């Protein structure tokens, strides 16, 4: 970061990095669930397992 | 039919930007300019679609 | 501190130079990386004119040269100086540059950086003198009184004069908005003598000074030199001054957040092409460009020949306004609505609510027909004088339409109509609500559950009107207030009441900003043949 | 009530102006018992040629000449003092009492 | 509960309201509304705490 930087933005304009005010270190922010998840099932009347 | 959509209020006090901007201060101006902007943008989107 | 004087000086030669691509600054503090931004503001246009002011002097044959006039501070300045040694030391900001109005100084003392905003009694030639390569004296001002702001920074320079070919180039830009003065800084080493160096430069902010100052003029403080004697002589230096203009540019940022190059829109057709596509490199082909080569700067205003002052005296400073149930209407026409003349009176409005128009834009707009309604209310009934209200007054006495366009005025009058002539009444006990802009001056005796009791002594029949108990030494509320309601009407009819704007001369075949009875716009004016 | 964005009056045009899109808070409270006794130091500016800019002030006490300029004396026709005194004194109505 | 809310009978009294703010409804459209359950809270404040 810059010496007076406090948080970093992305081209989609959301904060992905921040500087901790107490200990001057740089952290990373990412969503706690990103990426798709697909569930494969047979018919619910047919079976129960997925 | 596209040039005749410019005579629509779209929920604003007037269809003319000059009537709004000369009668209201700058703070109250955006809340009624935005309606005209969104309506004209929607008209342009529709025209491009057909 | 004992300012020195000069007897004869040569007339300034206002030679004009060209600024190639200089005069760009960081316009905000948002951090960016690898993006191209199109921004609008006050910038110095490319290939603009810069006026030079020299200071060199020889031993004989020529008079002294000291070009320090009152340069106007219109919307911003580009100050670039190409001195050798250290001759130009700071600037003077102000409006009249005398001790009857506050002025600011920002100059290098020699051992400090001095910033003061005081009532300065400047001498004819502000300067500071050095002798034998040492800081001798500072001769900027004589007296300084009535001020608070003072900042001093430790700094050090070498005041010894040198010789050469102007190895230093220092440039600044200045602008003040919202009470903050902005100073930007850049430095690079060049080798030119009597011409403005070319290239591209970016200015970085160093100051943001919080004084609210009306700044319209500008002056430069210089330095004198002596060969260790009483007599003082000048040295070689020159600076350039440019004015900022409202225009659009495109800025390009790298991955470190610095600006590599910028494109000034509306200079040549090539820059306009890059200004629309938001890119520095353009592929071959034909492109449809937007409009940027338009600078409407002239303001033309046309208002009718109405000149008389509008009668605010007989509608505000009158006697015996009627009660609320018998309010009166007044038609106001063929006058000039100057609201500033009400400031001179002793009465101050505690309610200045406007509905259809903004209160600030009343000196520019004009109306086709206006009306005035005036009455007297209880004091805490004033909040019922509004669109869509409920109460005694809003239901039985005075109702405003919900599509109300106008303003409501109110002020407390406890010392004039609480002692004598206390015949103020309001209508209670009505069968049904009242319509907007209607009144009923009737004293029929009210009977509940069917009318026509025809006697006050019967059971259930009451007087409709109840008297305001106006008397001195009561609280706020239960105290008389005088209310004036103004109703506006903006149509295609000819205007009757128009406020105080000085009309200008008509100009045609130019892209200007016009105003025809509150019909502001942008375009050209051409003689017509329509009926 | 004139200490607000987009206001008109004596204070909002000649004394103190807040800019549009102002971010912050404004505070006010009545102080009648502390500064009403022989104060005689509270003034406001009338009679200015032109409106004031946001966050700016002018402390000047020159004579005001109506429809012109550069007045000489107070006895000259159409010449007034620019500053007018608040008439602060105890036992006056609310609305004439000082507020901080 | 189980009453007819006639606000016009308060005009006959000697007390006048300095505050009649309403939230979620309009003061004019109270003679036509018909509520399911209402509650009342009453206390005394300093005057500039209103
Ligand atoms: C313009 O002016 C005209 C006249 O100048 C205004 O017209 C008047 O309008 C009012 C109301 O709209 C009207 O008052 C009614 O008159 C009736 C007689 O025709 C009364 O009988 C009536 O009172 C009772 O009768 C109704 C039927 O019984 C009840 O529904 C009503 O609530 C009253 O009943 C009471 O008593 C019973 C007893 O048990 C009780 O059960 C009820 O609950 C209630 O307590 C009204 O008072 C006038 O008569 C009209 N005037 C004329 C000359 O006709 C007109 O309104 C004005 N326009 C505007 C816009 O202001
Ligand atoms: C910063 O300070 C400067 C100077 O201190 C200040 O400039 C002043 O502006 C006012 C108004 O803009 C000027 O006052 C007017 O001056 C003209 C002459 O140019 C006079 O004619 C005016 O008098 C009447 O004119 C008309 C009749 O001919 C009338 O229609 C009109 O209503 C006037 O009654 C009027 O006095 C003043 O002259 C300048 N001062 C100087 C030294 O130039 C500037 O406004 C300040 N900036 C801000 C933002 O306040
Ligand atoms: C009076 C205003 C004034 C300003 C705005 C100013 C700013 C300024 N002067 C600098 C350097 C310097 N300042 C000067 C001299 C000047 N440069 C000037 O802007 C002027 C007017 C002089 C006057 C002689 C010199 C010689 C240096 C060299 C500092 C070094 O060795 O790094 C620097 C770069 C180093 C630093 O951040 O300290 C800044 C930002 N100095 C000033 O004196
Ligand atoms: C404020 O400015 C005025 C005039 O600009 C000053 O009055 C002059 O002071 C000089 C002192 O060098 C006298 O010689 C002149 O006779 C004075 N009058 C005029 C009309 O020039 C004044 O001294 C300044 N300072 C204050 C008032 O503190
Ligand atoms: C802030 O205080 C904590 C608590 O002791 C300390 O650990 C930390 O180093 C401090 N941060 C500073 C001084 O920047
Ligand atoms: C599940 O499928 C069987 C076989 O077709 C069918 O008989 C049964 O009705 C189905 N279950 C439901 C809940 O429809
Ligand atoms: C010097 O000043 C005097 C008085 O202003 C003037 O008459 C004279 O011409 C000046 N000298 C020159 C060389 O111009
Ligand atoms: C700028 O300077 C040139 C000569 O250097 C002159 O011809 C021109 O009129 C000046 N002004 C403008 C606006 O170009
Ligand atoms: C300015 O410099 C002089 C010496 O040239 C010094 O005496 C004085 O103290 C300096 N000013 C300030 C405010 O320190
Ligand atoms: C101005 O400064 C001088 C010193 O140069 C001093 O004698 C004079 O009293 C000052 N003026 C005022 C009004 O204090
Ligand atoms: C300005 O100075 C004068 C004396 O020179 C003084 O009477 C007055 O109170 C001062 N005003 C301010 C606002 O400091
Ligand atoms: C950007 O910053 C890095 C890190 O300080 C530096 O190595 C590099 O030279 C700078 N410039 C460019 C164009 O990457
Ligand atoms: C009307 O103005 C006169 C002076 O012009 C003043 O004495 C009087 O009190 C005013 N009446 C009002 C404001 O009702
Ligand atoms: C303002 O009021 C005073 C009296 O209070 C009066 O003498 C004067 O003529 C009025 N008008 C102006 C422009 O001062
Ligand atoms: C109104 O108040 C009076 C007393 O002020 C009372 O006699 C009367 O019964 C009340 N009601 C009506 C409908 O007048």
Tell the residue number behind the tokens 């109110």, with chain if given: C410
Closest chain C CA to residue B23: C357
Name every chain D residue with its beta carbon within 8 A of the beta carbon of B28. Answer: 6
Residue C159: other Cβ atoms inside 10 A: 22
Data resolution in angstroms: 3.0
Sheet holding C370-377, edge to edge: C328-332, C370-377, C481-487, C406-412, C351-354
What is the distance between the alpha carbons of residues C126 and C105, in angstroms, rounded to a whole number?
Answer: 11
Q: Are A19 and A1 in contact (CB under 8 A)?
A: yes
Q: Which ligand is nearest to the CA of D78?
A: 14
The residue count of chain A comes to: 50
3-class SS string, C262-321: EEECCCCHHHHHHHHHCCCCCCCCCCCCCCCCCCCCCEEEECCCCCCECCCHHHHCCCCC
Residue C396, token pair as written in the block: 């039985």
Ligand 12 centre and the CA of C254: distance in Å?
10
Tell the residue number behind the tokens 């004209």, with chain if given: B40
Residue E27, token pair as written in the block: 């003061």
State if residue C16 touches ligand 10 by the CB under 6 angstroms criterion: no
Residue C100, token pair as written in the block: 């009857």
Q: What is the DSSP letter of C11?
A: P
On the 0-12 / 13-18 / 19+ scale of CB atoms within 10 A, A17 is: middle
What is the distance between the alpha carbons of residues C337 and C349, in angstroms, rounded to a whole number?
Answer: 17
Q: What is the DSSP letter of D15?
A: I
Long-range (24+ apart) CB contacts under 8 A made by C252-258 are C252/C36, C252/C280, C253/C32, C253/C33, C253/C34, C253/C35, C253/C36, C253/C37, C254/C33, C254/C34, C255/C33, C255/C34, C256/C33, C257/A2, C257/C31, C257/C32, C257/C33, C258/C202
The residue count of chain C comes to: 531
Which chains have at least 3 CB atom pairs separated by less than 8 Å from chain E?
C
| Element (DSSP H or E) covering residue C174 | strand C168-177
Q: Do D59 and C146 touch (CB under 8 A)?
A: yes
Considering only CA atoms, which residue is closest to atom 8 of ligand 13?
C317
Q: Which residues contact C401 (CB under 8 A, 6 or more apart)?
A: C387, C436, C437
Ligand 8 centre and the CA of C49: distance in Å?
6
Chosen for mutation from D20, D22, D54 (greatest number of chain B CBs closer than 10 Å) is D20
Residue A45, token pair as written in the block: 């009347």
Taking CA C157 as the corner, what is the angle to CA C153 and CA C162, rounded to the nearest 5 degrees?
A: 160
Q: Do C257 and A9 touch (CB under 8 A)?
A: no
- Grouping H, G, I as helix, E, B as strand and the rest as coil, residue D63 is coil
Which of C251, C31, D78 has the alpha carbon at shortest distance from D70? D78
Name every chain A residue with its beta carbon within 8 A of the beta carbon of C257. Answer: 2
The residue count of chain D comes to: 100
State if residue D80 touches ligand 14 by the CB under 6 angstroms criterion: yes
Closest chain E CA to residue C402: E28
* Ordered DSSP codes for C225-247: B-SSSS--B----EEEEEE-EEE
Taking CA D68 as the corner, what is the angle to CA D66 and CA D73, rounded to the nearest 5 degrees?
A: 70
Q: What is the DSSP letter of C150?
A: E
Which ranges of C298-357 would DSSP assign to H, the alpha helix?
313-316
Chosen for mutation from E16, E17, E29, E50 (greatest number of chain C CBs closer than 10 Å) is E16
State if residue C100 touches ligand 11 by the CB under 6 angstroms criterion: no
The residue to mutate among C106, C109, C150, having the most atoms of ligand 9 within 8 angstroms of its beta carbon, is C109
Taking CA C298 as the corner, what is the angle to CA C297 and CA C303, rounded to the nearest 5 degrees?
A: 140
CA distances from C511 to C253, C269, C292 (A): 34, 20, 13
Q: Are D65 and D3 in contact (CB under 8 A)?
A: no
D93 part of contact set with chain C, CB < 8 Å: yes
C 246-265 → A contacts, CB under 8 A: 257
Which of C17, C24, C14, C12 has the alpha carbon at shortest distance from C65? C12
State if residue C141 touches ligand 10 by the CB under 6 angstroms criterion: no
Closest chain C CA to residue D63: C100
Q: What is the DSSP letter of C442?
A: -
Tell me, yes or no, whether chains B and E touch by having 3 or more C-beta pairs under 8 A: no
Task: State residue C302 phi and psi, 5-degree precision.
Answer: -130, 120
Please list every protein residue whose CB sits less than 6 Å from any atom of ligand 1. Answer: C 431-432, 434-435, 449-451
Q: What is the CA radius of gyration of chain A?
A: 21
| Element (DSSP H or E) covering residue C270 | helix C269-277
What is the distance between the alpha carbons of residues E33 and D44, in angstroms, rounded to a whole number?
Answer: 51
Tell the residue number behind the tokens 């309201």, with chain if given: E17
C63 part of contact set with chain E, CB < 8 Å: no
| Element (DSSP H or E) covering residue C272 | helix C269-277
Ligand 10 centre and the CA of C160: distance in Å?
31
Long-range (24+ apart) CB contacts under 8 A made by B5-14 are B5/B39, B5/B40, B5/B43, B6/B40, B8/B39, B9/B35, B10/B35, B10/B36, B10/B38, B10/B39, B10/B40, B11/B35, B12/B36
Q: Are C107 and C220 in contact (CB under 8 A)?
A: no
3-class SS string, C474-514: CCCCCCCEEEEEEECCCCCCCCCEECCCCCCCCCCCCCEEE
Burial readout B5-39 (b: 16 or more C-beta within 10 A, e: otherwise): beeeebebeeebbebbbbbbbeeebeebeebbeeb
Burial readout C173-208 (b: 16 or more C-beta within 10 A, e: otherwise): bbbbeebebbbbebeeeeeeeeebbeeebbbeeeee
Q: Are C474 and C351 in contact (CB under 8 A)?
A: no
Q: Are C130 and C110 in contact (CB under 8 A)?
A: yes
**CA end-to-end span of chain C:** 73
Which of B22, A22, B46 has the alpha carbon at shortest distance from C517? B22
Sheet holding C521-523, edge to edge: C299-302, C512-516, C521-523
Q: Which residues contact D31 (CB under 8 A, 6 or more apart)?
A: D98, D99, D100
Residue D89: other Cβ atoms inside 10 A: 14
What is the distance between the alpha carbons of residues C359 and C163, in angstroms, rounded to a whole number?
Answer: 63
What is the distance between the alpha carbons of residues B13 and D5, in angstroms, rounded to a whole number?
Answer: 22
Checking DSSP bridges between strand C299-302 and strand C512-516, what pairing results, if any? parallel
CA distances from C238 to C139, C158, C521 (A): 21, 19, 44
**CA end-to-end span of chain D:** 13
Checking DSSP bridges between strand C200-210 and strand C180-189, what pairing results, if any? antiparallel
- Residues C25, C28, C30, C34, CA torsion sign: negative
Q: Are D13 and D46 in contact (CB under 8 A)?
A: no
Residue A22, token pair as written in the block: 């107490």
| Element (DSSP H or E) covering residue A8 | strand A7-9
What is the distance between the alpha carbons of residues D52 and D71, in angstroms, rounded to a whole number?
Answer: 21
Tell the residue number behind the tokens 């011409």, with chain if given: C195
Residue E16: other Cβ atoms inside 10 A: 16
State if residue C142 touches ligand 10 by the CB under 6 angstroms criterion: yes
Which ranges of B1-50 would DSSP assign to H, the alpha helix?
17-23, 26-49
What is the distance between the alpha carbons of residues A15 and D82, in angstroms, rounded to a whole number?
Answer: 53
State if residue C121 touches ligand 4 by the CB under 6 angstroms criterion: yes
* Ordered DSSP codes for A9-40: E-TT--EEEEE-SSS--EEE---SS-S-----
Q: Which ligand is nearest to the CA of A20?
A: 5
Task: State residue C276 phi and psi, 5-degree precision.
Answer: -90, -40
Residue C392, token pair as written in the block: 């005694």
Q: Are C479 and C379 in contact (CB under 8 A)?
A: yes
- Grouping H, G, I as helix, E, B as strand and the rest as coil, residue C396 is helix
State if residue C347 touches ligand 13 by the CB under 6 angstroms criterion: yes
Q: Which ligand is nearest to the CA of C217?
A: 2
* Ordered DSSP codes for C363-374: SS-EES-EEEEE
- Grouping H, G, I as helix, E, B as strand and the rest as coil, residue C255 is coil
Q: What is the DSSP letter of C432?
A: S
Name every chain C residue with its beta carbon within 8 A of the beta carbon of D54. Answer: 178-179
What's the CA dihedral at C310, C313, C315, C316 to 10 degrees?
130
E 3-32 → C contacts, CB under 8 A: 7, 11-12, 16-18, 20, 26-28, 30
Considering only CA atoms, which residue is closest to atom 23 of ligand 3?
C89
- Grouping H, G, I as helix, E, B as strand and the rest as coil, residue C440 is coil
| Element (DSSP H or E) covering residue C273 | helix C269-277
* Ordered DSSP codes for C105-119: EEEE-SSEEEEEEEE
What's the CA dihedral at E50, C410, D11, C338 to 10 degrees?
160
Considering only CA atoms, which residue is closest to atom 1 of ligand 14?
C344
Q: Are D83 and D61 in contact (CB under 8 A)?
A: yes
Beta carbon pairs, A and C, within 8 Å? 6
Q: Which ligand is nearest to the CA of C18?
A: 8
Residue C363: other Cβ atoms inside 10 A: 16
What is the distance between the alpha carbons of residues C91 and C73, in angstroms, rounded to a whole number?
Answer: 12
The approach used to solve this structure was cryo-EM
- Grouping H, G, I as helix, E, B as strand and the rest as coil, residue C340 is helix
What is the distance between the alpha carbons of residues C22 and C35, in angstroms, rounded to a whole number?
Answer: 21
**CA end-to-end span of chain E:** 27
Residue C320, token pair as written in the block: 């015996």
Considering only CA atoms, which residue is closest to atom 22 of ligand 4?
C121
Residue C156, token pair as written in the block: 């050090």
The residue count of chain B comes to: 50
Which of C523, C501, C486 has the alpha carbon at shortest distance from C366? C501
């Amino acid at each position: 970061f810059q010496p007076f930087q406090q948080f970093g933005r992305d081209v989609s304009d959301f904060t992905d990095s921040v500087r901790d005010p107490k200990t001057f270190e740089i952290l990373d922010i990412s969503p706690c669930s990103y990426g798709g998840v697909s569930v494969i099932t047979p018919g619910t009347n047919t079976s129960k397992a997925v | 039919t596209l040039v005749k959509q410019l005579s629509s209020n779209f929920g604003a006090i007037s269809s003319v930007l000059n009537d709004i901007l000369s009668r209201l201060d700058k703070v109250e101006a955006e809340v009624q300019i935005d309606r005209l902007i969104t309506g004209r943008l929607q008209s342009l989107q529709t025209y491009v679609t057909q | 501190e004992g300012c020195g004087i000069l007897s004869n000086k040569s007339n300034p030669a206002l030679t004009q130079y060209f600024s190639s691509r200089r005069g760009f600054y960081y316009f905000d503090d948002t951090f960016r990386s690898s993006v191209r931004v199109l921004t609008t503001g006050y910038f110095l246009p490319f290939n603009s004119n810069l006026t030079g002011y020299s200071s060199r002097n020889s031993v004989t044959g020529r008079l002294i040269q000291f070009d320090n006039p009152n340069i106007p501070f219109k919307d911003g300045l580009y100050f670039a100086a190409t001195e050798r040694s250290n001759v130009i030391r700071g600037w003077i900001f102000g409006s009249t540059l005398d001790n009857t109005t506050q002025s600011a100084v920002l100059f290098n003392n020699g051992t400090h950086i001095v910033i003061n905003v005081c009532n300065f009694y400047f001498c004819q030639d502000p300067m500071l003198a050095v002798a034998n390569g040492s800081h001798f004296k500072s001769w900027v001002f004589l007296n300084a009184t009535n001020c608070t702001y003072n900042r001093v920074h430790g700094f050090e320079i070498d005041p010894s004069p040198n010789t050469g070919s102007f190895i230093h180039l220092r440039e600044h830009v200045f602008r003040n908005v919202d009470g903050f003065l902005y100073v930007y800084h850049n430095y690079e080493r060049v080798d030119v003598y009597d011409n403005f160096p070319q290239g591209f430069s970016v200015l970085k902010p160093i100051f943001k000074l919080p004084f609210g100052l009306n700044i319209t003029q500008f002056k430069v403080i210089m330095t004198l030199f002596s060969p260790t004697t009483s007599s003082f002589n000048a040295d070689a230096s020159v600076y350039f001054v440019g004015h900022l203009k409202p225009l659009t540019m495109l800025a390009e940022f790298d991955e470190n957040g610095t600006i590599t190059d910028a494109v000034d829109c509306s200079q040549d057709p090539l820059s306009e092409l890059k200004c629309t596509t938001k890119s520095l490199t353009v592929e071959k082909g034909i492109y449809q460009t937007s409009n940027f080569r338009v600078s409407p700067s002239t303001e033309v205003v046309r208002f009718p020949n109405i000149t008389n002052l509008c009668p605010f005296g007989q509608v505000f400073n009158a006697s015996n306004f009627p009660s609320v149930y018998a309010w009166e209407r007044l038609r106001i026409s063929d006058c000039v609505a100057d609201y500033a003349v009400l400031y001179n009176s002793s009465s101050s409005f505690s309610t200045f609510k406007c509905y259809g128009v903004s209160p600030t834009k009343l000196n520019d707009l004009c109306f086709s027909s206006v009306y005035a309604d005036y009455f007297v209310v209880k004091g805490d009934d004033v909040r019922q004088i509004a669109p869509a209200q409920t109460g005694v007054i809003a239901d039985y006495n005075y109702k405003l339409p919900d599509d109300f366009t106008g303003c409501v005025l109110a002020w407390n009058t406890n010392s004039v109509d609480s002692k004598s002539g206390n015949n103020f009444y309001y209508r209670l006990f009505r069968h049904g609500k009242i319509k907007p802009y209607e009144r009923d001056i009737s004293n029929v005796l009210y009977n509940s559950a069917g009318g026509t009791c025809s006697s006050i002594s019967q059971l259930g029949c009451y007087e409709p009107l109840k008297s305001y108990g106006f008397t001195p030494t009561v609280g706020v509320g239960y105290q008389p207030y005088r209310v004036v309601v103004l109703s506006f009407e903006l149509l295609n009819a000819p205007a009757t009441v128009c406020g105080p704007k000085k009309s200008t001369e008509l100009v045609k075949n130019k892209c200007v900003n016009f105003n025809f009875n509150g019909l502001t716009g942008t375009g050209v004016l051409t003689s017509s043949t329509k009926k």
